[PDB]
Write a protein that binds this ligand. Structure first.
Ligand SMILES: [Cu+2]
Ligand SMILES: [Cu+2]
Ligand SMILES: [Cu+2]
Ligand SMILES: [Cu+2]
Ligand SMILES: [Cu+2]
Ligand SMILES: [Cu+2]
Ligand SMILES: [Cu+2]
Ligand SMILES: [Cu+2]
Ligand SMILES: [Cu+2]
Ligand SMILES: [Cu+2]
Ligand SMILES: [Cu+2]
Ligand SMILES: [Cu+2]
Ligand SMILES: [Cu+2]
Ligand SMILES: [Cu+2]
Ligand SMILES: [Cu+2]
Ligand SMILES: [Cu+2]
Ligand SMILES: [Cu+2]
Ligand SMILES: [Cu+2]
Ligand SMILES: [Cu+2]
Ligand code: NA
Ligand code: NA
Ligand code: NA
Lengths: 294, 294, 294
């Protein structure tokens, strides 16, 4: 797009504040930012807040979200669709024009690990260019296994195609399939979807810990066979709802937009790859590392 | 096929009558009918009863089905395979020759939302050309959530390829992925698998209702990530068995031939898209609309 | 590979002995063997023990496995990754050089139907060329339905691509998708992944039996929609863990590397096809037969 030529908007921080016991304000941007998705390969991504996937949003079950989107794109409208909320798509997930803002209000009444994304037509084009992310809604009474959990991270899987190529987006195989991590607490890694960053800079843990991962496969098009090498998932909660509780899985299937909470123990020191077991995708980038030390 | 050139057999109504407390007679046709699958695009479909997917069949758990197939195809044999039944495939799912009829008897002893299809070799060719559909077997004691349900519809997802092109059917991407609705009660929409009809003529509901959808992804080749925009599924029953009960899903993965009962609430007026969240497929047609009014 | 030109190493028998109440010794080979994957088509497979998929390994829950890999490949290193075990991938799933052996020890503490495979970079290349298989870990207290089960078999699904073609492995469709059976008890069929052997030589059962299948889809790349024609699965245990118990499924979705225990009844004599219901794959070979006699 001619108007995006030489646009590179620096990342803006997620703005969030709680205004009531069950009411939260969140403010995000839609903006155009260059992301290195593979070594030497830039993608002029369509983003929320200059990150792809977008920044992590965490709320509590029963929170009402008062959402503001500032659209910094100089030419293309953008919108926001949270999978966590009950809303009217045609009133509450509407387009916000270039240089304008819109504020929408809706409740998050179910716990889980929900995808979020732009809902502007054509939706495939806006998702594939980078407008996705995850919102975690914490359960009111936790998970049954919370007391066993030593450590937590958030991982997202996504695909990259030929830049802004609608024929590729529809008919082509992915050029890259990648993981990213988003921070739950200051100090945790917060990265973009690329082929290399979680290889070079592994996630960390200690020998003997039980690790919880909140995972979502945002696609846009592929399913995921998610698996951690050298362990078995003790517990899995489909979509992060406590009630959907499976045990002893080797591999967790995730639909496009699907999430889960998975928990597992690392019994010995060394480096544990994290993959999607559809190994064409793992070869195209979707291998993250977990380094476990004494 | 030369013998199908200029064949367009008008749709015939499903014939069904109950002959006992647990015995039902059903009579269908195999026939060749032109279907508009996309605007300006005709597909000379291989069908049951001139519909693709085929007509909706609804029976009760424990019913024995006495099935008759009249094969109206002037050259190609056809057969019927119900996923709901216990049968001998090589005696009970046999081919019925052109201009002949066959009658088969078998019981439906499990509740659910089962795929049905032609079982003639090569099976891919007969399915891809349009010979699929759904049979619902109602549970003897219902679902736990029946009292909460205000309204019900049936949705099927299918793919269309290059007409009668075995290389495309095997190796190609779908040209179209579509939804159709089938009627539970006179007055409900009953449509074919096309890109447009549920966009132009949405399904209807009222603000505040709990909606049940009986869904099956007949393929033939793809999986589905089924999701309703602006809501979360309160309850899901995998394959429509009451015992396979998940809660709070954002998205339901369906294998090829897979079904589910899903239930959700619409809290605000407007138009709610219904998609498969593998968004290449949604772009190729698989977006249905639900219009919710005061 | 020049050094594999005219290499055809004859199959070696799996070597297994129990050395303690909870300790087992297993010895396998990595070796290069010609497999007829389709009629008239040889694939110079990278194998464990001259079989593709590899030989069946069966242990008990809580067993510690003392594993030896003899690498008979004259040029390429190989390794072993068992999904059943808790291990350090970078110490315990390491490469064993040509003409050398390595011995590793790790526990199998969870019951199920686990994939196993070579873990040598690039992992896709080693899996796609044939280095996969299944290890069953029997539950300490069985499955709830053991008393109902009359008969058992093991089935694996895999893909074959263009020989040793990394571009095909990453970007291409499978050339073949196949089933194989592995023997639980001497006398049961033990076959390789090909298009024909379970068509010509069906699995056997008697009218009225409840049949248990232990299934795993090793991929490397595709998911499976597993379905037996003419029946409905009475019970399914995801990944073969007793706790993940679904009922009345028509079709079981399996991620890449995913497994399940499924059980079903055959009520009438004749031939029951076993398929993946993604029918492009079934057309490319993945149809097995079950013959049911009086
Ligand atoms: Cu309160
Ligand atoms: Cu406010
Ligand atoms: Cu957008
Ligand atoms: Cu969505
Ligand atoms: Cu701990
Ligand atoms: Cu593993
Ligand atoms: Cu009765
Ligand atoms: Cu009768
Ligand atoms: Cu047919
Ligand atoms: Cu079928
Ligand atoms: Cu109501
Ligand atoms: Cu949504
Ligand atoms: Cu003991
Ligand atoms: Cu030993
Ligand atoms: Cu190897
Ligand atoms: Cu693996
Ligand atoms: Cu029996
Ligand atoms: Cu069937
Ligand atoms: Cu699945
Ligand atoms: Na591995
Ligand atoms: Na949406
Ligand atoms: Na069938």
């Amino acid at each position: 797009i001619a108007a995006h030529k030489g646009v590179n908007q620096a990342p803006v921080p997620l703005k969030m504040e709680r205004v009531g016991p069950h009411d939260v304000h969140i403010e995000m941007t839609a903006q155009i930012t260059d992301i290195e998705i593979d070594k030497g390969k830039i993608y002029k991504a369509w983003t929320f807040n200059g990150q792809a996937p977008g920044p992590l949003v965490v709320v509590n079950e029963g929170d009402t979200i008062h959402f503001t989107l500032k659209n910094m794109d100089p030419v293309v409208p953008h919108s926001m669709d949270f999978h966590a909320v009950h809303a009217s798509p045609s009133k509450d997930f509407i387009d916000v024009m270039p240089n304008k803002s819109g504020t929408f209000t809706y409740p998050a009444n179910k716990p889980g690990v929900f995808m979020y994304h732009c809902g502007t037509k054509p939706v495939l084009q806006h998702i594939a260019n980078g407008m996705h992310g995850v919102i975690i809604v914490k359960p009111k009474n936790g998970y049954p296994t919370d007391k066993e959990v030593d450590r937590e991270y958030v991982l997202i899987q996504n695909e990259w195609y030929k830049y802004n190529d609608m024929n590729d987006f529809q008919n082509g195989v992915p050029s890259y399939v990648v993981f990213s991590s988003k921070a739950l607490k200051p100090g945790d890694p917060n990265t973009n979807g690329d082929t290399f960053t979680l290889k070079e800079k592994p996630l960390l843990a200690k020998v003997g810990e039980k690790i919880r991962l909140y995972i979502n496969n945002v696609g846009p098009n592929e399913v995921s066979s998610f698996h951690v090498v050298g362990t078995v998932f003790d517990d899995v909660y489909l979509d992060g709802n406590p009630n959907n509780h499976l045990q002893g899985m080797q591999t967790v299937m995730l639909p496009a937009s699907g999430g889960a909470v998975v928990e597992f123990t690392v019994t010995r020191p060394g480096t544990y790859p994290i993959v999607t077991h559809q190994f064409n995708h793992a070869q195209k980038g979707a291998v993250a590392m977990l380094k476990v030390t004494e």
